[PDB]
Every structure is written in structure tokens, then in C-alpha cells.
Design a binder for this molecule. Structure first.
Ligand SMILES: Cn1cc(-c2ccnc3c2OCCNC3)c(-c2ccc(F)cc2)n1
Length: 263
């Protein structure tokens, strides 16, 4: 179907936090795009709020470009550049196993994405594999952060921080602690509180038991995040340096060759 004079709406590929995702084509520029549809009459409209967040975050590395914003028939329409698969899709495609090199290359970029969002006075609140996409073509080495539907100016139970389970207001430390669980999830293939209550299991699982058999940096990362105060500005540089020093000790080259590039 025709959308905003130049876009052609394609098939539904999935969903966001508050709307359906579709594939699409920018007919004028000759480029494939991603289209997010809301519902004009929705009780809690949020698509234009999210567009404002994306607009404010433009210019930042790994922040997707929003091409158009409007309303077509029954829906509010946001048009974004086409990005690649999610880290969740890539993990499943890689048989739910990532090499240490891949986990570290992902960690370096993911910490930077979270830090940029925080530098722009926002917390993400839903740091999970599904919310990170690899770019396509020339941007195939780039980790993009998506979905600002749950974002707030300063989530998923599997990756939620202990503070979140306790019902505490989310802050900068919570986005980073969630990233720590995502990194361990990539190392193990699953988390001990997956497919189980989750709060009880997370609190009864010492960081050292969770990270057993894996480099100490993953535990040090989670311990640092769990030690941060509510209003604390996290030391993002320290956390990246933690994984960067391990990357160098392992003798890996920062060449952006991920496990999926080997298929
Ligand atoms: C959950 N989700 C995922 C994509 C997504 C974005 C870009 N490209 C793709 C996306 O889906 C993954 C698969 N690759 C194709 C969005 C999205 C967001 C805003 C928008 F306006 C449009 C889409 N949301």
C-alpha cells in the first residue's frame, strides 16, 4: 500500500514495544526501509514521542536514521532506514552460541550505545538482544540500538536488574546491569532463571556461580553495576577497558569479524 507519497508498505516482520514493524520501499530514493505503524486512535499515543527521542539522538553512532513521520489512514507512521537482524535473531542463527571474540566485540559497542543514550538524558529500560540490530552492507560491522517506547528522561524480566525486581525506579546502572545479563546469556546460551520466581532465582544465584568457567571480567562487570548508587554516573570507560584488556590478552584482532560472518 502507498504511504506518504513515496513509500510502499511491505509485509509485517514483527513488533516493537507499542506497534507493528513492516518492511517497505522508498520508491523515490530506490531504497528498502523499515516502517513502524501505531493506530491513530490508540488510548496512549507514543509514536510521535518516540520519533522525538530518535530525532534528539541523531548524529550518535549506531542510532538509526528516521526518514519520515506522518499519519496514513488508521495509523501513525514512522519510517526508518533498513537495518539488519537483531542480536537475538543472530544468536539463534548461530545455534545459541557465540565465541568469546564475538561477545567482546558486541560488549564494546553495546556499552557505547548505552553511554550515548545516557549522555542524551535518557535511560533505555529494555536492554535485551532483540533491541540491538546489526546494520546492513557498509554498516554491517555496526551495532545499532533500537526501540525507545519504554525509554524515560532520567522491561523484560529475563534481563531486568535486581533493583528492578525490587520495584526500584530504573536509572543508568540498570541499563548496564541488563547488558551484563545479556553478555552472560550470549556466553551460556541461556540464563539460569530462563524458562522457569525470576527475582528469587536471580537473587539466589551468586555472580561468581552465574559467571563460573568464563573470564572474570563478566563477573567484575556485573559486580561494578550492582555496586553503583541510584544517581551515580557509571564509569563506562572502565567497563569497556575491562573487556578491551581481556580482548588483548586473548590475542584477538579488532577486525569486526563476528561468528555469523563465518557462515
Ligand atoms: C523491534 N524493531 C525492529 C525494527 C527494525 C528496524 C529496522 N530494520 C529492521 C527492523 O527489524 C529487525 C529486522 N531487520 C529490519 C524496528 C523498527 C523501529 C522503528 C521503525 F520506524 C521501524 C522499525 N523495531
Amino acid at each position: 500500500l502507498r504511504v506518504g507519497n513515496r513509500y510502499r508498505l511491505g509485509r509485517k516482520i514483527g513488533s516493537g514495544s507499542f506497534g507493528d514493524i513492516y518492511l517497505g520501499t522508498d520508491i523515490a530514493a530506490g531504497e528498502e526501509v523499515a516502517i513502524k505503524l501505531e493506530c491513530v486512535k490508540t488510548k496512549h499515543p507514543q509514536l510521535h514521542i518516540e520519533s522525538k527521542i530518535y530525532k534528539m539522538m541523531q548524529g550518535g553512532v549506531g542510532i538509526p536514521t528516521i526518514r519520515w513521520c506522518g499519519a496514513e489512514g488508521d495509523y501513525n507512521v514512522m519510517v526508518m532506514e533498513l537495518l539488519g537482524p537483531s542480536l537475538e535473531d543472530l544468536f539463534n542463527f548461530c545455534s545459541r552460541k557465540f565465541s568469546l571474540k564475538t561477545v567482546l566485540l558486541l560488549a564494546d559497542q553495546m556499552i557505547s550505545r548505552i553511554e550515548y543514550i545516557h549522555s542524551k538524558n535518557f535511560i533505555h529500560r529494555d536492554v535485551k538482544p532483540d533491541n540491538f540490530l546489526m546494520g546492513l552492507g557498509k554498516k554491517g560491522n555496526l551495532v545499532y540500538i533500537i526501540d525507545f517506547g519504554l525509554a524515560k528522561k532520567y522491561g523484560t524480566a529475563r534481563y531486568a536488574s535486581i533493583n528492578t525486581h525490587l520495584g526500584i525506579e530504573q536509572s543508568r546502572r540498570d541499563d548496564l546491569e541488563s547488558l551484563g545479563y545479556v553478555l552472560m546469556y550470549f556466553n551460556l546460551g541461556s540464563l539460569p532463571w530462563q524458562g522457569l520466581r525470576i527475582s528469587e532465582k536471580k537473587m539466589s544465584t551468586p555472580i561468581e556461580v552465574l559467571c563460573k568457567g568464563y573470564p572474570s571480567e563478566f563477573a567484575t562487570y556485573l559486580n561494578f553495576c550492582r555496586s553503583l548508587r541510584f544517581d551515580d554516573k557509571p564509569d563506562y570507560s572502565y567497563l569497556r577497558q575491562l573487556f578491551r584488556n581481556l580482548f588483548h590478552r586473548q590475542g584477538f584482532s579488532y577486525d569486526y569479524v563476528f561468528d555469523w560472518n563465518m557462515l
